[PDB]
């Protein structure tokens, strides 16, 4: 079925969660510099950019199972658009998470 | 942007021959595969299919177990074993691609648009 | 495979005249029905796709219509080199499969 892929990229959201909390965790707290905040936003951007690759790479996957299976020309079609919708909600939440990780007036760090 | 195709020609009923259709200009290795032959002065008919290297093939019933259809995408090449031959057998056979493929943000579906020229099996003692 | 059923097997016709030619699918097939055109000792040629859709380079008075199992090439006006065979083609599930093909005569 396509729940193997909605789960699929569900449970990358999940692994960018964790890895963003850790993300998060190991940031320098306290009184930092400006040049320092921007260091700290273009690795969240980094790992959101690995995440989202990993994403992409299984996106082509099964976009090549649907074609290959023997079912019906327009239901290839319906099925890589919902799995592209898929895909395209899991990158979004990402950045969402990678965003977020250095929100400003949060406990962490402040100018 | 052609399929040229190797083999074919005359053979002894019950003989074996065996088709080559070389790609090139495109992207073989997605795109379903296809043989269609034509008895001489008779219609369109397919006769073999096959998927991106998968599993999946199809034969039409005339050709069950004799005939085999290879495929590989690393020389962007397809194939037609073709055993136990019978008179019936004589065709002009091509092998065509079907245009046909799904990424979501872009699509075509154009069916079989990209023939060979042809080759002629004849079956005959 | 799908069963697919054409007719007429045969028609003769007149430059500039309206020629129709019928196919008939044993399922439905939606929107994915094909028109090719072979002439004597040539590859077949892809003239309509999608039933409706017209490849590229293929002349204007050449149409398509309908959708589910009732389907319908058009030639408006006959041409004398439109003297071939023609062939409908479900496309719309593996394996695809032909009609038995429509020879059309030109009447001069």
């Known amino acids: 079925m396509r729940e193997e892929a909605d789960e699929d990229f569900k449970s990358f959201v999940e692994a960018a969660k964790d890895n963003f909390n850790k993300f998060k965790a190991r940031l320098r707290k306290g009184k930092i510099t400006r040049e320092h905040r921007e260091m700290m936003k273009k690795l969240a951007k980094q790992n959101a950019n690995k995440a989202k690759e990993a994403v992409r790479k299984r996106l082509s996957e099964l976009l090549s199972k649907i074609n290959d299976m023997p079912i019906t020309n327009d239901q290839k079609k319906l099925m890589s658009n919902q799995v592209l919708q898929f895909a395209d909600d899991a990158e979004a939440e990402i950045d969402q998470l990678a965003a977020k990780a250095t929100k400003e007036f949060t406990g962490g760090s402040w100018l | 942007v052609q399929l040229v195709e190797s083999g074919g020609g005359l053979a002894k009923p019950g003989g074996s021959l065996r088709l080559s259709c070389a790609a090139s200009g495109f992207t073989f290795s997605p795109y379903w595969m296809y043989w269609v032959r034509q008895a001489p002065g008779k219609g369109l008919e397919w006769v073999s299919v096959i998927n991106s290297g998968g599993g999946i093939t199809y034969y039409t019933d005339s050709v069950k177990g004799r005939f085999t259809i290879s495929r590989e995408n690393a020389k962007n090449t397809l194939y037609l074993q073709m055993d136990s031959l019978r008179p019936e057998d004589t065709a002009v056979y091509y092998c065509?691609?079907?245009?046909?493929?799904?990424?979501?943000?872009?699509?075509?579906?154009?069916?079989?648009?990209?023939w060979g020229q042809g080759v002629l099996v004849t079956v005959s003692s | 495979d799908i069963q697919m059923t054409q007719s007429p097997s045969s028609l003769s016709a007149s430059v500039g005249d309206r020629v129709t030619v019928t196919c008939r699918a044993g399922?439905?097939?939606?929107?994915?029905l094909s028109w090719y055109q072979q002439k004597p000792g040539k590859v077949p040629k892809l003239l309509i796709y999608?039933?409706?859709s017209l490849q590229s380079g293929v002349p204007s008075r050449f149409s398509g219509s309908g959708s589910g199992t009732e389907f319908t090439l058009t030639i408006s006006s006959l041409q004398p080199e439109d003297f071939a065979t023609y062939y409908c083609?479900?496309?719309?599930?593996?394996?695809?499969?032909f009609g038995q093909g429509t020879k059309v005569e030109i009447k001069r």
């Open positions: 083609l479900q496309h719309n599930i593996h394996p695809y499969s």
């Open positions: 999608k039933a409706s």
């Open positions: 065509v691609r079907d245009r046909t493929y799904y990424s979501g943000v872009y699509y075509t579906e154009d069916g079989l648009d990209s």
């Open positions: 399922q439905g097939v939606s929107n994915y």
